[PDB]
């Protein structure tokens, strides 16, 4: 019974979240459905880092532009990108030509650009 | 209205995190409780939603604990 | 303290949600409680199950009691006994408009749930 | 359907309100509250969910002096 109650509560939670229809919540939810998930709690102050998994180039080009990462309705300055082999990836490498040569998924470490 | 619904959702979210065995003595749990408290005390939706983003991200960061695609079905 | 502020916010939101649900049974027991007509035990859902309720005044009595039937929580209950504030039995013929000032209010009604 | 999510959300809040009122120290009473909360979460239709909500809410309404009803309303 305990597993059914947990399933019911979690399903109701995301039904409630959908009905709220908030842009920031929908962004992190829909990103999570595509495998673009945070690795730590999303901070609201610039004095804390954020780490997010970027599963493929299609997601990368929809959220990243130069040193700026767009996520949770906010801007983040990228500090590090590491590939699936835990090797550092230069931002110049993450282009449309060199993308097949990268080891996806990538993990981006970023600092919040502005307060919430 | 949205204000009551957001606060109701934040209570459900903290209960969901509690059942997923987030240790009550951990730093993460104290952060979740503080966010839950701030949402309940919020006076406008902008503050409440920003805090809900942080609180919900705790659930989205727990890999293998929940499959989001099945819950959104 | 801070715990009391959080508690107040949660309880206020709870009754806001309950009001939004707008269920006849919930509205009935909420509206009764704000008038002082409160249950003394968990409201049961099965036939012939026991229930005790405080009746604060004659106006509440007339709105909820008709002969031996008690109407409460969108259900019908079979009145078994009525006792006054001094735990003395009150016959139903005493509970009239002319005689109610002579009774030791509030009364406590004991009843059994009916069927259907 | 949409009212099913709302009533299930409200039942989680109601149990949390009872928990903060220290009903959990009463082992048997809290056990009944948890079972009612579980029955709402698993309810097939709104009729059953509201019937169980009547029982669960009556726990809060029966606690004399625990809350000021007309103020919270």
mmCIF file of C-alpha atoms in Angstrom:
data_model
loop_
_atom_site.group_PDB
_atom_site.id
_atom_site.type_symbol
_atom_site.label_atom_id
_atom_site.label_comp_id
_atom_site.label_asym_id
_atom_site.label_seq_id
_atom_site.Cartn_x
_atom_site.Cartn_y
_atom_site.Cartn_z
ATOM 1 C CA UNK A 1 0.000 0.000 0.000
ATOM 2 C CA UNK A 2 2.842 2.379 0.865
ATOM 3 C CA UNK A 3 4.142 2.303 -2.715
ATOM 4 C CA UNK A 4 0.686 3.098 -4.122
ATOM 5 C CA UNK A 5 0.258 6.070 -1.757
ATOM 6 C CA UNK A 6 3.681 7.410 -2.751
ATOM 7 C CA UNK A 7 2.844 7.035 -6.444
ATOM 8 C CA UNK A 8 -0.499 8.786 -5.902
ATOM 9 C CA UNK A 9 1.055 11.685 -3.988
ATOM 10 C CA UNK A 10 3.827 12.214 -6.556
ATOM 11 C CA UNK A 11 1.374 12.117 -9.459
ATOM 12 C CA UNK A 12 -0.899 14.654 -7.763
ATOM 13 C CA UNK A 13 2.142 16.860 -7.101
ATOM 14 C CA UNK A 14 2.968 17.276 -10.778
ATOM 15 C CA UNK A 15 -0.705 17.700 -11.657
ATOM 16 C CA UNK A 16 -0.769 20.590 -9.176
ATOM 17 C CA UNK A 17 2.485 21.928 -10.655
ATOM 18 C CA UNK A 18 1.023 21.793 -14.171
ATOM 19 C CA UNK A 19 -2.070 23.732 -13.072
ATOM 20 C CA UNK A 20 0.099 26.446 -11.504
ATOM 21 C CA UNK A 21 1.409 27.148 -15.036
ATOM 22 C CA UNK A 22 4.449 29.138 -13.919
ATOM 23 C CA UNK A 23 7.144 29.695 -16.535
ATOM 24 C CA UNK A 24 10.094 28.972 -14.242
ATOM 25 C CA UNK A 25 8.585 25.769 -12.830
ATOM 26 C CA UNK A 26 7.569 24.587 -16.298
ATOM 27 C CA UNK A 27 11.108 25.258 -17.524
ATOM 28 C CA UNK A 28 12.867 23.058 -14.975
ATOM 29 C CA UNK A 29 10.123 20.409 -15.201
ATOM 30 C CA UNK A 30 10.209 20.183 -19.003
ATOM 31 C CA UNK A 31 14.012 20.265 -18.971
ATOM 32 C CA UNK A 32 13.989 17.412 -16.454
ATOM 33 C CA UNK A 33 11.644 15.427 -18.706
ATOM 34 C CA UNK A 34 14.298 15.746 -21.441
ATOM 35 C CA UNK A 35 17.113 14.640 -19.120
ATOM 36 C CA UNK A 36 18.336 18.199 -18.409
ATOM 37 C CA UNK A 37 18.352 17.979 -14.617
ATOM 38 C CA UNK A 38 20.107 19.920 -11.847
ATOM 39 C CA UNK A 39 22.725 18.127 -9.785
ATOM 40 C CA UNK A 40 22.270 20.383 -6.734
ATOM 41 C CA UNK A 41 19.640 22.733 -5.345
ATOM 42 C CA UNK A 42 19.016 25.721 -7.626
ATOM 43 C CA UNK A 43 20.358 28.767 -5.750
ATOM 44 C CA UNK A 44 18.763 32.197 -5.653
ATOM 45 C CA UNK A 45 21.966 34.035 -4.666
ATOM 46 C CA UNK A 46 25.092 34.519 -6.764
ATOM 47 C CA UNK A 47 27.171 33.108 -3.867
ATOM 48 C CA UNK A 48 26.437 29.486 -4.828
ATOM 49 C CA UNK A 49 27.177 27.346 -7.870
ATOM 50 C CA UNK A 50 24.705 25.454 -10.036
ATOM 51 C CA UNK A 51 25.439 22.199 -11.871
ATOM 52 C CA UNK A 52 23.159 20.884 -14.631
ATOM 53 C CA UNK A 53 23.323 17.861 -16.935
ATOM 54 C CA UNK A 54 23.001 18.731 -20.629
ATOM 55 C CA UNK A 55 22.087 15.463 -22.381
ATOM 56 C CA UNK A 56 22.684 16.348 -26.050
ATOM 57 C CA UNK A 57 23.593 19.156 -28.426
ATOM 58 C CA UNK A 58 19.935 19.917 -29.174
ATOM 59 C CA UNK A 59 19.441 20.840 -25.514
ATOM 60 C CA UNK A 60 22.767 22.710 -25.402
ATOM 61 C CA UNK A 61 21.886 25.033 -28.278
ATOM 62 C CA UNK A 62 18.458 25.695 -26.708
ATOM 63 C CA UNK A 63 19.937 26.758 -23.340
ATOM 64 C CA UNK A 64 23.523 27.970 -23.941
ATOM 65 C CA UNK A 65 24.912 30.926 -25.888
ATOM 66 C CA UNK A 66 28.590 31.735 -25.421
ATOM 67 C CA UNK A 67 29.312 32.008 -21.694
ATOM 68 C CA UNK A 68 25.612 32.422 -20.810
ATOM 69 C CA UNK A 69 23.351 29.539 -19.753
ATOM 70 C CA UNK A 70 19.584 30.115 -19.611
ATOM 71 C CA UNK A 71 17.755 28.007 -17.040
ATOM 72 C CA UNK A 72 14.947 28.385 -14.487
ATOM 73 C CA UNK A 73 14.018 31.783 -15.980
ATOM 74 C CA UNK A 74 17.438 33.214 -15.130
ATOM 75 C CA UNK A 75 20.897 33.778 -16.597
ATOM 76 C CA UNK A 76 23.993 31.884 -15.434
ATOM 77 C CA UNK A 77 27.652 32.425 -16.346
ATOM 78 C CA UNK A 78 29.362 29.149 -17.228
ATOM 79 C CA UNK A 79 32.407 28.253 -15.118
ATOM 80 C CA UNK A 80 33.123 24.718 -16.358
ATOM 81 C CA UNK A 81 31.865 22.096 -18.805
ATOM 82 C CA UNK A 82 32.874 18.443 -18.371
ATOM 83 C CA UNK A 83 32.030 15.552 -20.681
ATOM 84 C CA UNK A 84 30.848 12.039 -19.802
ATOM 85 C CA UNK A 85 34.508 10.996 -19.435
ATOM 86 C CA UNK A 86 34.992 13.773 -16.834
ATOM 87 C CA UNK A 87 37.273 15.729 -19.193
ATOM 88 C CA UNK A 88 37.119 19.525 -19.411
ATOM 89 C CA UNK A 89 35.470 20.840 -22.587
ATOM 90 C CA UNK A 90 36.326 24.282 -23.928
ATOM 91 C CA UNK A 91 33.311 26.357 -24.934
ATOM 92 C CA UNK A 92 34.815 26.712 -28.417
ATOM 93 C CA UNK A 93 34.637 22.922 -28.868
ATOM 94 C CA UNK A 94 30.856 22.849 -28.357
ATOM 95 C CA UNK A 95 30.027 23.931 -31.909
ATOM 96 C CA UNK A 96 27.783 22.438 -34.567
ATOM 97 C CA UNK A 97 30.762 20.818 -36.320
ATOM 98 C CA UNK A 98 32.649 19.372 -33.335
ATOM 99 C CA UNK A 99 29.559 18.234 -31.396
ATOM 100 C CA UNK A 100 29.674 14.611 -32.695
ATOM 101 C CA UNK A 101 33.202 14.407 -31.254
ATOM 102 C CA UNK A 102 32.103 15.246 -27.687
ATOM 103 C CA UNK A 103 31.200 12.661 -25.035
ATOM 104 C CA UNK A 104 27.597 13.430 -24.101
ATOM 105 C CA UNK A 105 26.051 14.132 -21.686
ATOM 106 C CA UNK A 106 27.899 17.229 -20.485
ATOM 107 C CA UNK A 107 27.743 18.728 -16.996
ATOM 108 C CA UNK A 108 27.793 22.526 -16.813
ATOM 109 C CA UNK A 109 28.861 24.423 -13.689
ATOM 110 C CA UNK A 110 27.569 27.979 -13.600
ATOM 111 C CA UNK A 111 27.173 30.997 -11.335
ATOM 112 C CA UNK A 112 23.938 32.988 -11.255
ATOM 113 C CA UNK A 113 24.273 36.266 -13.158
ATOM 114 C CA UNK A 114 21.602 38.230 -11.262
ATOM 115 C CA UNK A 115 19.567 37.917 -8.085
ATOM 116 C CA UNK A 116 16.022 36.552 -8.189
ATOM 117 C CA UNK B 1 -6.291 31.469 -6.787
ATOM 118 C CA UNK B 2 -2.627 30.794 -7.495
ATOM 119 C CA UNK B 3 -1.472 31.944 -4.046
ATOM 120 C CA UNK B 4 -3.259 29.230 -2.068
ATOM 121 C CA UNK B 5 -2.501 26.580 -4.715
ATOM 122 C CA UNK B 6 1.246 27.312 -4.631
ATOM 123 C CA UNK B 7 1.360 27.054 -0.840
ATOM 124 C CA UNK B 8 -0.663 23.827 -0.909
ATOM 125 C CA UNK B 9 1.717 22.404 -3.528
ATOM 126 C CA UNK B 10 4.740 23.292 -1.391
ATOM 127 C CA UNK B 11 3.347 21.240 1.503
ATOM 128 C CA UNK B 12 2.856 18.280 -0.856
ATOM 129 C CA UNK B 13 6.384 18.745 -2.209
ATOM 130 C CA UNK B 14 7.954 18.687 1.257
ATOM 131 C CA UNK B 15 5.912 15.586 2.111
ATOM 132 C CA UNK B 16 7.110 13.895 -1.097
ATOM 133 C CA UNK B 17 10.722 14.703 -0.203
ATOM 134 C CA UNK B 18 10.153 13.362 3.313
ATOM 135 C CA UNK B 19 8.925 10.001 1.997
ATOM 136 C CA UNK B 20 11.981 9.800 -0.289
ATOM 137 C CA UNK B 21 14.109 9.476 2.882
ATOM 138 C CA UNK B 22 15.869 12.841 2.784
ATOM 139 C CA UNK B 23 17.616 12.581 6.152
ATOM 140 C CA UNK B 24 16.074 14.955 8.690
ATOM 141 C CA UNK B 25 19.516 15.816 10.112
ATOM 142 C CA UNK B 26 21.046 16.627 6.714
ATOM 143 C CA UNK B 27 21.824 20.110 5.427
ATOM 144 C CA UNK B 28 19.557 19.411 2.446
ATOM 145 C CA UNK B 29 16.529 18.787 4.666
ATOM 146 C CA UNK B 30 17.039 22.019 6.614
ATOM 147 C CA UNK B 31 17.217 23.842 3.275
ATOM 148 C CA UNK B 32 13.977 22.180 2.135
ATOM 149 C CA UNK B 33 12.218 23.078 5.397
ATOM 150 C CA UNK B 34 13.386 26.685 5.188
ATOM 151 C CA UNK B 35 12.132 26.988 1.590
ATOM 152 C CA UNK B 36 8.791 25.436 2.555
ATOM 153 C CA UNK B 37 8.512 27.919 5.431
ATOM 154 C CA UNK B 38 9.371 30.871 3.176
ATOM 155 C CA UNK B 39 6.761 29.829 0.598
ATOM 156 C CA UNK B 40 4.061 29.601 3.267
ATOM 157 C CA UNK B 41 5.067 33.045 4.572
ATOM 158 C CA UNK B 42 5.270 34.604 1.095
ATOM 159 C CA UNK B 43 3.062 37.612 0.365
ATOM 160 C CA UNK B 44 3.275 37.694 -3.456
ATOM 161 C CA UNK B 45 3.460 34.939 -6.057
ATOM 162 C CA UNK B 46 6.829 36.085 -7.443
ATOM 163 C CA UNK B 47 8.612 35.299 -4.173
ATOM 164 C CA UNK B 48 6.702 32.026 -3.740
ATOM 165 C CA UNK B 49 7.529 30.744 -7.239
ATOM 166 C CA UNK B 50 11.235 31.586 -6.979
ATOM 167 C CA UNK B 51 11.417 29.572 -3.750
ATOM 168 C CA UNK B 52 9.373 26.739 -5.286
ATOM 169 C CA UNK B 53 11.952 26.552 -8.095
ATOM 170 C CA UNK B 54 14.654 25.854 -5.509
ATOM 171 C CA UNK B 55 12.514 23.412 -3.525
ATOM 172 C CA UNK B 56 11.323 21.497 -6.597
ATOM 173 C CA UNK B 57 14.905 21.283 -7.890
ATOM 174 C CA UNK B 58 15.704 19.105 -4.867
ATOM 175 C CA UNK B 59 13.232 16.538 -6.186
ATOM 176 C CA UNK B 60 14.464 16.885 -9.782
ATOM 177 C CA UNK B 61 18.070 16.321 -8.649
ATOM 178 C CA UNK B 62 17.336 12.960 -6.982
ATOM 179 C CA UNK B 63 18.315 10.592 -9.782
ATOM 180 C CA UNK B 64 16.531 7.248 -9.887
ATOM 181 C CA UNK B 65 14.201 8.230 -7.042
ATOM 182 C CA UNK B 66 11.378 9.405 -9.334
ATOM 183 C CA UNK B 67 10.723 9.142 -13.073
ATOM 184 C CA UNK B 68 9.323 12.534 -14.044
ATOM 185 C CA UNK B 69 7.921 11.362 -17.390
ATOM 186 C CA UNK B 70 5.703 8.757 -15.726
ATOM 187 C CA UNK B 71 4.476 11.227 -13.091
ATOM 188 C CA UNK B 72 3.537 13.755 -15.805
ATOM 189 C CA UNK B 73 1.602 11.072 -17.712
ATOM 190 C CA UNK C 1 7.698 32.776 17.214
ATOM 191 C CA UNK C 2 8.591 31.747 13.659
ATOM 192 C CA UNK C 3 6.946 28.341 14.115
ATOM 193 C CA UNK C 4 3.669 30.056 15.054
ATOM 194 C CA UNK C 5 3.792 32.311 11.989
ATOM 195 C CA UNK C 6 4.300 29.291 9.717
ATOM 196 C CA UNK C 7 1.513 27.396 11.486
ATOM 197 C CA UNK C 8 -0.879 30.327 11.051
ATOM 198 C CA UNK C 9 -0.084 30.563 7.335
ATOM 199 C CA UNK C 10 -0.616 26.820 6.850
ATOM 200 C CA UNK C 11 -3.957 26.763 8.685
ATOM 201 C CA UNK C 12 -5.198 29.827 6.788
ATOM 202 C CA UNK C 13 -4.283 28.178 3.483
ATOM 203 C CA UNK C 14 -6.027 24.957 4.559
ATOM 204 C CA UNK C 15 -9.403 26.621 5.048
ATOM 205 C CA UNK C 16 -8.880 28.605 1.849
ATOM 206 C CA UNK C 17 -8.460 25.294 0.007
ATOM 207 C CA UNK C 18 -11.457 23.779 1.811
ATOM 208 C CA UNK C 19 -13.611 26.768 0.861
ATOM 209 C CA UNK C 20 -12.495 26.426 -2.772
ATOM 210 C CA UNK C 21 -13.484 22.742 -2.802
ATOM 211 C CA UNK C 22 -17.055 23.816 -1.922
ATOM 212 C CA UNK C 23 -18.270 20.372 -0.882
ATOM 213 C CA UNK C 24 -21.660 20.217 0.832
ATOM 214 C CA UNK C 25 -20.556 17.872 3.617
ATOM 215 C CA UNK C 26 -17.345 19.784 4.374
ATOM 216 C CA UNK C 27 -19.124 23.151 4.235
ATOM 217 C CA UNK C 28 -21.733 21.816 6.668
ATOM 218 C CA UNK C 29 -19.290 20.725 9.365
ATOM 219 C CA UNK C 30 -17.143 23.841 8.868
ATOM 220 C CA UNK C 31 -20.129 26.189 9.150
ATOM 221 C CA UNK C 32 -21.338 24.250 12.192
ATOM 222 C CA UNK C 33 -17.931 24.466 13.879
ATOM 223 C CA UNK C 34 -17.666 28.243 13.477
ATOM 224 C CA UNK C 35 -21.017 28.487 15.305
ATOM 225 C CA UNK C 36 -19.807 26.219 18.126
ATOM 226 C CA UNK C 37 -21.462 23.011 16.872
ATOM 227 C CA UNK C 38 -18.448 20.685 16.870
ATOM 228 C CA UNK C 39 -18.020 16.892 16.972
ATOM 229 C CA UNK C 40 -16.610 15.177 20.037
ATOM 230 C CA UNK C 41 -15.194 12.246 18.041
ATOM 231 C CA UNK C 42 -14.210 11.353 14.492
ATOM 232 C CA UNK C 43 -17.274 11.464 12.248
ATOM 233 C CA UNK C 44 -17.903 7.832 11.241
ATOM 234 C CA UNK C 45 -19.066 6.665 7.836
ATOM 235 C CA UNK C 46 -20.780 3.318 8.560
ATOM 236 C CA UNK C 47 -24.352 2.479 9.503
ATOM 237 C CA UNK C 48 -25.243 2.593 13.223
ATOM 238 C CA UNK C 49 -21.874 4.160 14.103
ATOM 239 C CA UNK C 50 -21.725 6.441 17.131
ATOM 240 C CA UNK C 51 -21.356 10.225 17.086
ATOM 241 C CA UNK C 52 -21.467 12.914 19.787
ATOM 242 C CA UNK C 53 -21.861 16.604 18.922
ATOM 243 C CA UNK C 54 -22.026 19.782 20.996
ATOM 244 C CA UNK C 55 -25.148 21.856 20.302
ATOM 245 C CA UNK C 56 -24.495 25.418 21.567
ATOM 246 C CA UNK C 57 -27.923 27.053 21.314
ATOM 247 C CA UNK C 58 -31.564 26.542 20.395
ATOM 248 C CA UNK C 59 -31.099 28.067 16.935
ATOM 249 C CA UNK C 60 -28.471 25.446 16.109
ATOM 250 C CA UNK C 61 -30.763 22.782 17.567
ATOM 251 C CA UNK C 62 -33.720 23.669 15.342
ATOM 252 C CA UNK C 63 -31.535 23.880 12.225
ATOM 253 C CA UNK C 64 -30.083 20.408 12.855
ATOM 254 C CA UNK C 65 -32.682 18.424 14.840
ATOM 255 C CA UNK C 66 -36.164 17.364 13.713
ATOM 256 C CA UNK C 67 -37.832 14.881 16.032
ATOM 257 C CA UNK C 68 -35.373 12.048 16.637
ATOM 258 C CA UNK C 69 -33.349 12.730 13.457
ATOM 259 C CA UNK C 70 -30.098 14.717 13.509
ATOM 260 C CA UNK C 71 -28.835 16.225 10.234
ATOM 261 C CA UNK C 72 -25.071 16.713 10.055
ATOM 262 C CA UNK C 73 -22.201 16.199 7.587
ATOM 263 C CA UNK C 74 -24.720 15.574 4.775
ATOM 264 C CA UNK C 75 -26.019 12.516 6.645
ATOM 265 C CA UNK C 76 -28.911 11.465 8.863
ATOM 266 C CA UNK C 77 -28.338 10.349 12.454
ATOM 267 C CA UNK C 78 -30.692 8.676 14.943
ATOM 268 C CA UNK C 79 -30.671 10.640 18.207
ATOM 269 C CA UNK C 80 -30.191 8.370 21.226
ATOM 270 C CA UNK C 81 -29.726 10.802 24.135
ATOM 271 C CA UNK C 82 -29.428 14.531 24.808
ATOM 272 C CA UNK C 83 -27.713 15.804 27.963
ATOM 273 C CA UNK C 84 -27.203 19.351 29.224
ATOM 274 C CA UNK C 85 -24.097 21.153 30.505
ATOM 275 C CA UNK C 86 -24.504 19.383 33.875
ATOM 276 C CA UNK C 87 -24.693 15.917 32.235
ATOM 277 C CA UNK C 88 -28.413 15.629 33.053
ATOM 278 C CA UNK C 89 -30.769 14.001 30.550
ATOM 279 C CA UNK C 90 -32.987 16.416 28.603
ATOM 280 C CA UNK C 91 -36.231 15.128 27.129
ATOM 281 C CA UNK C 92 -36.912 16.296 23.588
ATOM 282 C CA UNK C 93 -40.195 17.923 24.656
ATOM 283 C CA UNK C 94 -38.207 20.363 26.830
ATOM 284 C CA UNK C 95 -36.252 21.739 23.835
ATOM 285 C CA UNK C 96 -38.711 24.395 22.694
ATOM 286 C CA UNK C 97 -38.440 28.109 21.983
ATOM 287 C CA UNK C 98 -40.350 29.015 25.144
ATOM 288 C CA UNK C 99 -38.440 26.635 27.436
ATOM 289 C CA UNK C 100 -34.912 26.748 25.970
ATOM 290 C CA UNK C 101 -33.726 29.638 28.226
ATOM 291 C CA UNK C 102 -34.416 27.274 31.150
ATOM 292 C CA UNK C 103 -31.985 24.638 29.826
ATOM 293 C CA UNK C 104 -28.290 24.407 30.712
ATOM 294 C CA UNK C 105 -26.742 25.033 27.315
ATOM 295 C CA UNK C 106 -24.764 23.742 25.567
ATOM 296 C CA UNK C 107 -26.365 20.335 25.027
ATOM 297 C CA UNK C 108 -24.559 17.180 23.928
ATOM 298 C CA UNK C 109 -26.357 14.910 21.460
ATOM 299 C CA UNK C 110 -25.449 11.239 21.043
ATOM 300 C CA UNK C 111 -26.620 9.660 17.799
ATOM 301 C CA UNK C 112 -26.189 6.697 15.450
ATOM 302 C CA UNK C 113 -25.664 7.022 11.701
ATOM 303 C CA UNK C 114 -28.615 5.936 9.552
ATOM 304 C CA UNK C 115 -28.495 4.212 6.141
ATOM 305 C CA UNK C 116 -28.364 5.496 2.540
ATOM 306 C CA UNK D 1 -10.754 15.418 -12.231
ATOM 307 C CA UNK D 2 -9.255 18.823 -11.478
ATOM 308 C CA UNK D 3 -11.109 18.749 -8.152
ATOM 309 C CA UNK D 4 -9.511 15.357 -7.432
ATOM 310 C CA UNK D 5 -6.042 16.928 -7.435
ATOM 311 C CA UNK D 6 -7.238 19.795 -5.219
ATOM 312 C CA UNK D 7 -8.908 17.545 -2.649
ATOM 313 C CA UNK D 8 -5.866 15.256 -2.522
ATOM 314 C CA UNK D 9 -3.588 18.281 -2.083
ATOM 315 C CA UNK D 10 -5.834 19.563 0.715
ATOM 316 C CA UNK D 11 -5.673 16.220 2.542
ATOM 317 C CA UNK D 12 -1.868 16.379 2.645
ATOM 318 C CA UNK D 13 -2.106 19.894 4.091
ATOM 319 C CA UNK D 14 -4.707 18.732 6.616
ATOM 320 C CA UNK D 15 -2.472 15.904 7.833
ATOM 321 C CA UNK D 16 0.459 18.338 8.095
ATOM 322 C CA UNK D 17 -1.679 20.747 10.142
ATOM 323 C CA UNK D 18 -2.584 17.877 12.478
ATOM 324 C CA UNK D 19 1.086 16.884 12.723
ATOM 325 C CA UNK D 20 2.116 20.402 13.772
ATOM 326 C CA UNK D 21 -0.677 20.293 16.383
ATOM 327 C CA UNK D 22 1.199 17.297 17.864
ATOM 328 C CA UNK D 23 -1.513 14.732 17.123
ATOM 329 C CA UNK D 24 1.287 12.332 16.134
ATOM 330 C CA UNK D 25 2.068 11.823 19.838
ATOM 331 C CA UNK D 26 -1.351 10.134 20.122
ATOM 332 C CA UNK D 27 -0.413 6.836 18.489
ATOM 333 C CA UNK D 28 -3.857 5.406 17.732
ATOM 334 C CA UNK D 29 -5.486 8.698 16.737
ATOM 335 C CA UNK D 30 -2.588 9.513 14.406
ATOM 336 C CA UNK D 31 -2.857 6.030 12.889
ATOM 337 C CA UNK D 32 -6.483 6.743 11.963
ATOM 338 C CA UNK D 33 -5.502 10.097 10.437
ATOM 339 C CA UNK D 34 -2.785 8.469 8.312
ATOM 340 C CA UNK D 35 -5.189 5.796 7.059
ATOM 341 C CA UNK D 36 -7.789 8.425 6.120
ATOM 342 C CA UNK D 37 -5.082 10.438 4.359
ATOM 343 C CA UNK D 38 -4.039 7.273 2.511
ATOM 344 C CA UNK D 39 -7.650 6.511 1.543
ATOM 345 C CA UNK D 40 -8.083 9.987 0.044
ATOM 346 C CA UNK D 41 -4.852 9.717 -1.952
ATOM 347 C CA UNK D 42 -6.051 6.366 -3.349
ATOM 348 C CA UNK D 43 -9.670 7.461 -3.856
ATOM 349 C CA UNK D 44 -11.296 6.367 -7.116
ATOM 350 C CA UNK D 45 -13.828 9.213 -7.279
ATOM 351 C CA UNK D 46 -14.543 12.525 -5.585
ATOM 352 C CA UNK D 47 -17.469 11.111 -3.588
ATOM 353 C CA UNK D 48 -15.257 8.723 -1.617
ATOM 354 C CA UNK D 49 -12.484 11.314 -1.262
ATOM 355 C CA UNK D 50 -14.832 13.878 0.296
ATOM 356 C CA UNK D 51 -16.452 11.308 2.601
ATOM 357 C CA UNK D 52 -13.017 10.428 3.997
ATOM 358 C CA UNK D 53 -12.196 14.146 4.162
ATOM 359 C CA UNK D 54 -15.242 14.601 6.412
ATOM 360 C CA UNK D 55 -13.757 12.091 8.862
ATOM 361 C CA UNK D 56 -10.246 13.541 8.622
ATOM 362 C CA UNK D 57 -11.335 17.174 9.005
ATOM 363 C CA UNK D 58 -13.509 16.275 12.004
ATOM 364 C CA UNK D 59 -10.298 15.404 13.874
ATOM 365 C CA UNK D 60 -9.232 19.043 13.603
ATOM 366 C CA UNK D 61 -12.736 20.346 14.354
ATOM 367 C CA UNK D 62 -12.941 18.223 17.531
ATOM 368 C CA UNK D 63 -9.751 19.674 19.079
ATOM 369 C CA UNK D 64 -11.113 22.283 21.487
ATOM 370 C CA UNK D 65 -9.025 25.442 21.698
ATOM 371 C CA UNK D 66 -6.414 24.106 19.265
ATOM 372 C CA UNK D 67 -7.438 26.548 16.507
ATOM 373 C CA UNK D 68 -9.650 29.625 16.198
ATOM 374 C CA UNK D 69 -12.085 28.523 13.502
ATOM 375 C CA UNK D 70 -13.827 31.816 12.729
ATOM 376 C CA UNK D 71 -10.458 33.573 12.453
ATOM 377 C CA UNK D 72 -9.049 30.955 10.058
ATOM 378 C CA UNK D 73 -12.246 31.130 7.973
#
